[PDB]
């Protein structure tokens, strides 16, 4: 029984709604196998290392994302930035949960709404394969039509300039999602696993085993296991891979720091990082393989090419997995199972992301610790109100903007600043001593080198290319207006600037000379007596040569 509990905990932690919803369309958008190379490389060299770093930071300091920067006070803007990023991401994560809930409610029938045309939401162009412009998305399949017109009601929106009013069915589903979130978070800290640690893998295995047998699935498997190396010479695949690594692993959100701050101090964060990263890699490879088998099946059913058969946006799984369920026997049972799985995964991830904000901000302000019901209500209600934009008629455009900018360059920059503040200013040797205190072994050279040089360097590379090789935002054949790009960059900068803003604020608020202020800002808050003694390690070269 205890072994089963450990297995469930580790595999449930490894699996995120990102792995099952977001990875498929970044994988499809970037050709598949070509996406898996930068993704695996980034996992190894920055994601597992920084996942480990965040776990150890939270578990050693017993703090959330913001207050963990008592070890280097100048870097608390980083914690504030990751909290803001987590809030932004919750503004559209719960809308994907609301889509899952809508699809589950729609799954309680013997005639699934996405199998045929002839519904009230179907356009005259709906083409039922059972009874095309090359560089264009199909959009006329029964599943694509169900999603876009009967779920999103996107046909009633011309663009992000005309998003319309919140669709009321999605409004009720979002209300249910956020009420469940509140009452799952209001009386205690986030830290069901017989659903969120077993159903994702059973569903993934069923999809893989069934899809490999679908007609045309071989073509999708060949497209997936085909590396288009020309894609690897552009920055899009690398940026997408780095962002997906940090999105699925939970770094750059304060989620890992807050989660670990509630762990036992002697818990093995190294084994946790290894298990989570290995399972993330395996469930991403298998998730891509299954979604590309389905895509190769739809390219054969719809007689369209794989690169044009489905969306490259957020709702790709809400077309692909309904398409796979339709081919399964007892498709209603499988629809319910899949959308219960999606709802559970999303609710778990959203509770973790909300606890990131709640813990990070209640650790910083202790008045908030005495009011968890009220502060949790504030967070959930704000998230609901600002997610109301992504359940409008043109809410897919708002969701695309957010899924591009809330945690993109901003999340990469936040994890880069975390890595720098921990491994250069606090000291990677000091951090290794902390990890030895927790676990009894000191981190190896691979981890310290990654923390100090490799993960920071690759993160800086992706951050720079994300800015200089930025591509204007589009949703399928829809090109967002330029002001939408400026708004998205404003959303990214809103968290990115908290770092320098907090550095300036901390410098100006501190008293003393310039060097006294610098020493107080780089020394841990519990060692500030050393500043008066002129005993700052960061003012010596041996500190910065440390590895």
């Amino acid at each position, epitope marked *: 029984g205890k072994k089963i509990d450990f297995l469930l905990s580790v595999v449930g932690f490894a699996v995120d709604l990102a792995n099952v919803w977001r990875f498929p369309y970044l994988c499809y958008k970037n050709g598949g196998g070509a996406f898996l190379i930068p993704y695996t490389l980034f996992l190894i060299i920055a994601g597992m290392p920084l996942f480990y770093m965040e776990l150890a930071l939270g578990q*050693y*300091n*017993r*703090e959330g994302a913001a207050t963990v920067w008592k070890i280097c006070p100048f870097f608390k803007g980083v914690g504030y930035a990751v909290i803001l990023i987590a809030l932004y991401v919750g503004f559209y994560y719960n809308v994907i949960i609301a889509w899952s809930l809508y699809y589950l409610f729609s799954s309680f029938t013997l005639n699934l709404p996405w199998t045929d045309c002839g519904h009230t939401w179907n356009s005259p162009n709906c083409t039922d394969p059972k009874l095309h412009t090359k560089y264009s998305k199909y959009k006329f399949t029964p599943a694509a039509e169900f999603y876009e017109r009967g779920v999103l009601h996107l046909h009633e929106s011309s663009g992000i300039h005309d998003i319309g009013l919140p669709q009321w069915q999605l409004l009720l589903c979002l209300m249910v999602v956020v009420i469940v979130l509140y009452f799952s978070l209001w009386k205690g*800290v986030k830290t069901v696993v017989w659903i969120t640690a077993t159903l994702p893998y059973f569903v993934l295995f069923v999809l893989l085993v069934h899809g490999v047998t679908l007609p045309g699935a071989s073509n999708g498997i060949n497209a997936y296991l085909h590396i288009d190396f020309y894609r690897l010479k552009e920055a899009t695949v690398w940026i997408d891979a780095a962002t997906q690594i940090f999105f699925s692993l939970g770094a750059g959100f304060g989620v890992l720091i807050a989660f670990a*701050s*509630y762990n*036992k*101090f*002697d818990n093995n964060c190294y084994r946790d990082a290894l298990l989570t990263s290995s399972i993330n890699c395996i469930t991403s490879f298998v998730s891509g393989f299954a979604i590309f088998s389905i895509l190769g099946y739809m390219a054969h059913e719809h007689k369209v090419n794989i690169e044009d058969v489905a969306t490259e946006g957020a709702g790709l799984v809400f077309i692909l997995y309904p398409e796979a369920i339709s081919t399964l026997s007892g498709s209603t049972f499988w629809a319910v199972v899949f959308f219960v799985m999606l709802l559970a995964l999303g609710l778990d991830s959203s509770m973790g992301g909300m606890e990131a904000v709640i*813990t990070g901000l*209640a*650790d910083d302000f*202790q008045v908030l*610790k*005495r009011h*968890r019901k009220l502060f949790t209500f504030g967070v959930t209600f704000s998230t609901f109100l600002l997610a109301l934009f992504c359940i409008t008629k043109g809410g897919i455009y708002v969701l695309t903007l957010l899924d591009t900018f809330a945690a993109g360059t901003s999340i990469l920059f936040a994890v880069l600043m975390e890595a720098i503040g921990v491994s250069w200013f606090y000291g990677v040797d000091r951090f290794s001593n*902390d990890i030895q*205190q927790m676990m009894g072994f000191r981190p190896g050279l691979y981890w310290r080198l990654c923390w100090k040089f490799v993960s920071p360097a690759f993160l800086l590379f992706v951050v720079v290319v994300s800015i200089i090789n930025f591509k204007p935002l589009t949703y399928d054949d829809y090109i967002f207006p330029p002001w939408a790009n400026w708004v998205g960059w404003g959303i990214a900068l809103s968290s990115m600037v908290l770092v320098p803003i907090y550095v300036i604020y901390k410098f100006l608020s501190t008293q003393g000379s310039l060097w006294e202020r610098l020493a107080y800002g780089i020394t841990p*808050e*519990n*060692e500030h007596h050393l500043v008066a003694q002129r005993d700052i390690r960061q003012f010596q070269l041996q500190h910065w040569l440390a590895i």
Partner: nanobody
Amino acid sequence: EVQLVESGGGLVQAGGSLRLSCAASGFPVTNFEMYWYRQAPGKEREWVAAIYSTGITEYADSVKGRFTISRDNSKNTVYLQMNSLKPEDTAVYYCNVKDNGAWRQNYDYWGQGTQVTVS
């Protein structure tokens, strides 16, 4: 792993001074809340002093202005400098560790206790 070993107790004349030590192990006293309790003979456990992860110290009204709680993060030791010891201060002084904050409630380790007797 979490081990608290109190020391520094013993006989002391009324109005004297004693410094208790709590050699903590298995955790950093800097990131955890450290408490001092005392169980007088025939009474219940009375909370005496608390130093929090931030270094903020709280004292019971019965010891305010007399007992001082401090910690040595380098030594991972918590001290209780007890001054002007009244005969009523005789008790077994226990050192307690709690996790940082009210939402972290999985640490409540105690020491064996150090006996303080004021004659």
